């Protein structure tokens, strides 16, 4: 094993080197390249990765700085986040229409929310501010045209009606909107965010994407079947995102119903995704060559989000932190690949390095996930998410409401 994680100082060093290796994948700060994206999209034969994964990377580094105190990449990350906001400061740049799902937009909004929560340095005064960007994403996701009567509500996966998948009302789109609402409620103390989050969670429960008995979290269903054709694939990021949002709702509301939802979601996650203490992507990891580029990132979100759950729902700490520790140990045990002696693969539970080429990418998602898992070992030393009591960001009451906003020509 190359990386050592047995003390705070070892974890900091390992995380620093992991942050370096992940950054090698990113070219967006170089002359002639596009800030905020990893190489791609694969539809243009430019690389393995889609736009939203750039947003995921940005958030990973906002967390990295928050967890380690290392600001080395902050300028690169600010540039990347600001470059992708779009003309209406809502993370709907039109050049990316083909990739514009509520999930894709949601992940960028969640990185902006995280920047506000983590007191990440503010953009210049003339540029969109982190809280305002999260508010804009949330507001566009709350817009009435995104909430029709099919399946008695819920967001569709895609934003443009002509995008393939507009007929799929899926967990992730709704989970992103739920999580943003819960987090905006806690930060701003505005209850309209919370009422929407309650409504969307109740919809996810009613439609049965949350299993009423087991609290498994399925993937989605299609409008032409009234959402009854449930795709029962259980992706780790869906349950973990609902856990994260539920923890924010528990912290904000202090309502026992939210504590029960936290506990039930957490029981399900530990049962389903942790195998001998190691996170495992059950829909695809069972054999090599099945996980998509997107799926290779999920276990990093699981670690980062579950670690925050322990701060805002502290009664969960002893259920979560020991399991994140064993999962992160497995992550680093297999970061031993050539040519560097420290290259990271995906198959942590297996105990062995597998070349990311088996899954047809250069390995950025695997690198991101290990960075996330190792950094998040420092959660016990980190400040909890800030609210507007101590945060430094600024909001915008008209976030998402510009007259040139896409909702105005839907």
Ligand X SMILES: OC[C@H]1O[C@H](O)[C@@H](O)[C@@H](O)[C@@H]1O
Residue 104 touches ligand X, criterion: CB under 6 A? no
β-strands 274-275, 278-279: how paired?
Answer: antiparallel
Q: Which of 79, 211, 294, 396 binds ligand X (CB under 6 A)?
A: 294
Single residue of 159, 279, 295, 312 touching ligand X by CB under 6 A:
295
Give Cα separations from 292 to 42, 138, 277 (angstroms).
12, 27, 23
Q: Does 291 engage in binding with ligand X (CB under 6 A)?
A: no
Among 20, 164, 195, 233, which residue sits at the site for ligand X (rule: CB under 6 A)?
233
Q: Give the CA distances from residue 38 to residues 23, 48, 94, 368, in Å, rounded to whole numbers and listed in that order.
A: 10, 8, 18, 11
300 contributes a contact to ligand X by CB under 6 A: no
Q: Which residue in 102, 170, 253, 361 binds ligand X (CB under 6 A)?
A: 170
**48 carries a ligand binding annotation:** yes
Stretches 10-18, 250-258, 259-267, 289-297: which one binds ligand X (CB under 6 A)? 289-297
- Buried/exposed code over 198-234 (b: 16+ C-beta within 10 A; e: otherwise): bbbbebbeebebbbeeebbbbbbbbbeeebeebbeeb
Among candidate residues 100, 245, 221, 218, the one with its CA nearest the CA of residue 152: 221
Considering only 29, 122, 190, 231, the residue that binds ligand X (CB under 6 A) is 231
Rounded CA separation 335/321 (Å): 21
- Using CB under 6 A as the binding rule, whether residue 219 contacts ligand X is answered as yes
Which of 18, 172, 241, 249 is the binder for ligand X (CB under 6 A)?
172
Residue 176 CB, nearest approach to Ca ion (Å): 11
> Is 163 one of the binding residues for ligand X (CB under 6 A)?
no
Q: Which residues contact 176 (CB under 8 A, 6 or more apart)?
A: 102, 103, 105, 106, 107, 109, 110, 141, 241
Among Ca ion, ligand X, none, the one that 360 touches (CB under a kind-dependent 5 to 8 A) is Ca ion
- Give the CB-side neighbour count of residue 148, counting CA atoms within 13 A: 12
Task: Please state the closest distance from residue 6 (CB atom) to ligand X, in A.
Answer: 34
Toward ligand X, which CB reaches closer, 103 or 359?
Answer: 103
Residue 45 marked ligand-binding: no
Decide: 229 and 235 in contact? Cβ < 8 Å.
no
Using the rule CB under 5 A, is 101 a contact of Ca ion?
yes
Question: Is residue 396 marked as binding?
Answer: no
| Main-chain dihedrals φ then ψ at residue 357, nearest 5 degrees | -60, -25
Interface contacts to Ca ion, rule CB under 5 A: 48, 99, 101, 104, 360
Interface contacts to ligand X, rule CB under 6 A: 103, 170, 172, 219-220, 231, 233, 235, 292, 294-295
């Amino acid at each position: 094993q190359y990386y050592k994680i047995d003390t705070k100082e070892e974890i900091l060093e390992s995380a620093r080197t992991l942050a370096y290796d992940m950054m090698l994948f990113y070219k967006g700060n170089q002359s002639g390249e596009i800030p905020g994206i990893l190489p791609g999209p694969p539809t243009e034969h430019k690389g393995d990765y889609y736009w939203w994964e750039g947003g995921a990377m940005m958030g990973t580094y906002v967390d990295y700085w928050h967890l380690t105190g290392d600001p080395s990449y902050n300028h690169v990350i600010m540039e990347g986040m600001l470059h992708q906001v779009g003309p209406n400061a809502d993370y709907q740049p039109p050049n990316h229409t083909a990739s514009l799902g509520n999930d894709d937009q949601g992940f960028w909004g969640m990185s902006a929310m995280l920047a506000a929560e983590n007191k990440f340095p503010n953009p210049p005064d003339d540029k969109p501010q982190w809280l305002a960007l999260a508010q804009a994403v949330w507001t566009t996701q709350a817009s009435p045209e995104r909430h029709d009567g099919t399946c008695n509500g819920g967001l569709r996966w895609q934003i443009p009606p002509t995008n393939a998948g507009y007929n799929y009302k899926n967990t992730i789109a709704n989970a992103c909107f739920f999580d943003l609402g819960a987090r905006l409620a806690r930060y701003t103390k505005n209850n309209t965010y919370a009422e929407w989050a309650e409504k969307i969670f109740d919809w996810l429960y009613a439609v049965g994407y949350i299993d009423h008995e087991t609290w498994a979290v399925y993937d989605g269903g299609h409008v032409e079947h009234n959402c009854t054709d449930i795709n029962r694939a259980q992706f780790s990021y869906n349950a973990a995102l609902l856990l994260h949002g539920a923890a924010f709702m528990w912290n904000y509301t202090e309502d026992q119903k939210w504590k029960d939802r936290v506990d039930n979601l957490l029981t399900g996650i530990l049962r389903d995704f942790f195998k001998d203490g190691v996170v495992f992507e059950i829909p695809c990891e069972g054999r090599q060559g099945a996980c998509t580029a997107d799926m290779l990132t999920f276990k990093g979100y699981v670690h980062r989000w579950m670690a925050v759950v322990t701060q805002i729902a502290p009664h969960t700490k002893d259920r979560i932190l020991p399991v994140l520790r064993t999962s992160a140990e497995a992550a680093v045990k297999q970061c031993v690949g050539p040519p560097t002696g420290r290259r990271c693969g995906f198959y942590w539970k297996s105990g062995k390095f597998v070349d990311p080429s088996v899954d047809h990418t250069s390995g950025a998602g695997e690198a991101m996930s290990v960075l996330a898992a190792v950094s998040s070992l420092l959660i016990e030393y980190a400040e909890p998410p800030a609210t507007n009591e101590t945060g430094i960001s600024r909001g915008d009451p008209n976030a998402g409401m510009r007259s040139r906003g896409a909702a105005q020509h839907f």
